[PDB]
Design a binder for these strands. Sequence first.
RNA 1: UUU
RNA 2: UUU
RNA 3: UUU
RNA 4: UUU
Lengths: 99, 99, 99, 102
Amino acid sequence: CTVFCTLAGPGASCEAYSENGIFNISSPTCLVNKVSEQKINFICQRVDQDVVVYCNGQKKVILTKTLVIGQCIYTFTSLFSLMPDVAHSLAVELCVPGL
Amino acid sequence: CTVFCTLAGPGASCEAYSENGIFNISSPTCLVNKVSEQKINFICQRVDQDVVVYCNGQKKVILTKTLVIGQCIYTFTSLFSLMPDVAHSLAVELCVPGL
Amino acid sequence: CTVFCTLAGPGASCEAYSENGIFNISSPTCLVNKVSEQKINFICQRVDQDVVVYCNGQKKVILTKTLVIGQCIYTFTSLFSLMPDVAHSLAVELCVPGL
Amino acid sequence: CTVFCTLAGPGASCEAYSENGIFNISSPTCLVNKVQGSEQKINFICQRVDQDVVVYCNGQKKVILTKTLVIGQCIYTFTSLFSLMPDVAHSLAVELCVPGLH
RNA sequence: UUU
RNA sequence: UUU
RNA sequence: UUU
RNA sequence: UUU
Ligand SMILES: *[C@@H]1O[C@H](CO)[C@@H](O[C@@H]2O[C@H](CO)[C@@H](O[C@@H]3O[C@H](CO)[C@@H](O)[C@H](O)[C@@H]3O)[C@H](O)[C@H]2NC(C)=O)[C@H](O)[C@H]1NC(C)=O
Ligand SMILES: *[C@@H]1O[C@H](CO)[C@@H](O[C@@H]2O[C@H](CO)[C@@H](O)[C@H](O)[C@H]2NC(C)=O)[C@H](O)[C@H]1NC(C)=O
Ligand SMILES: *[C@@H]1O[C@H](CO)[C@@H](O)[C@H](O)[C@H]1NC(C)=O
C-alpha cells in the first residue's frame, strides 16, 4: 500500500493507505499488527532503524533519511513563511539532495 | 464542504468537513477516495501542487501559499508566546499579506 | 465537559471529553456539531476569537491567550530540552503569568 | 501495555497499545477512562505533564517520565536543526540528547 | 488566516 | 499551564 | 520530497 | 530515545 510518516518526538507518526482496503499490516519497528479499512494510523517509537511496514503482502521501507528530508522541508518552509509564494519551493530546493 | 490542512513534513495533514455529511470525495494528489460521515481526515504526501479536493460536487483548492501563511501564524505566535495577550494578533498582522 | 486544544497552523486542534459521554456539542468557530462517546476531536480554522464550545448544555471558553501560554510551554521546553530534568518546569516558570 | 507520548502544548498526546487488546485503562491526570475483546490501541491526551504521565493499563502501572518526554522532544528538535544532513541528523540528535550515551 |  |  |  |  502507501505509507506516509512524519517525525514525532524520537520516533514517527504514520499512516498506511490502500484505496481498495488494507487487509493485513504489521511492522518490526512500529506499533501495528492487524490481520477492512483503507486507512490505518500508527506510531513508531524510534526511527533508529528505518520504518519497515509489511502491508498487503508488500514490504515497505521508509528510510529515516527520507523522513529527515521531509522534516527539512517543513522546517525551512516555516523559516521562509513570510514569503509564502516561494517558501515551499525554496525549502524543497534546499532540502532534497538529488535536484 | 470545508477543507482545512496544516503542514506535515513535506506535505499536509487535512480534514474535510460537512455538517450534513460527506457523500463523495477525491483528490489528484491527496490520499482520499470515497464513493455518510461528517468528517474525513487525510494526508497529502506533497504540496508542490496546491491541495485540490473534490467534495460533495465542489472543487476545493487550498493554495500551498495559504498553507504557508497559516504556518507563518503558528511560527510567529510561538516566537511571541511570552506575550500571550498579543502574540496571535501580532502573528496575523505580520503573516497575512495586506494587513 | 473538558476541552483541550493546541495550536495548529492559523487555528487549533481540539478534543472534547466527558466522563459520562458527549450528548451535545457545537461551536460558533470550530468544525463540530453533534445532536454518544466520551471523546470527540475537532479543529478550529481560526483563533482570532477565543475557542467557544457548547458541550452538554455547558458553555466552554478556552482563551487564545491560554492557548498561547500552552504553546509557550511547548516552545521553551524544546529550547531547554538538553536539560530534560528541568526543561518543563523552567518553561512553566517563564511562560505562566501567575508564577 | 505500551505507552508512547509526545509533547503537545503544555501537556502530551499519547497512545496506548496492547497486542491482545486494551480492556482497562485509566490515569490520575490524563483524559482516559475505560473499563470492560476490545481494541488494540487508544489515543488520549494529558492536559499537563507537571507530574509525569501515569497510565494504569490492563492492571499494570505505566510511568512515562516528563524527563523522558523531553529527551524525545530534544531528538525531534535537533533532528530538525540538522535536517540539511539527513543521513546523520537523527543519529547526531540521539547522541546529543540521550543522557550518558556514547 | 483553508477561500 | 485548556478554566 | 514516504519510494 | 516511552522503560
Ligand atoms: C478490568 O477490570 C475489571 C474490574 O476492575 C476486572 O474484572 C474482574 O473480572 C474477574 C473475572 O474476569 C472477576 O472475578 C470474578 O468474580 C465473580 C464475582 O464477582 C465470580 O463469580 C467469578 O467466578 C470470578 O471470580 C473480578 O471480580 C473482576 N474484578 C472486579 C473488581 O470486579 C477485569 O478482569 C479487568 N481486566 C483486565 C484485562 O485487567
Ligand atoms: C458527489 O455527490 C454530490 C452530492 O449528491 C453530487 O452532486 C449532485 O449529483 C447529481 C447527480 O448527477 C446532480 O444531478 C446534481 O446536480 C449534483 N449537485 C451538486 C450540487 O453537485 C455529485 O454529482 C457527486 N459527484 C461524484 C463525482 O460522485
Ligand atoms: C444539548 O443537550 C443539553 C443537555 O441535555 C440541552 O440542555 C440542550 O438544550 C441541548 N442543545 C443545545 C444546543 O445545547
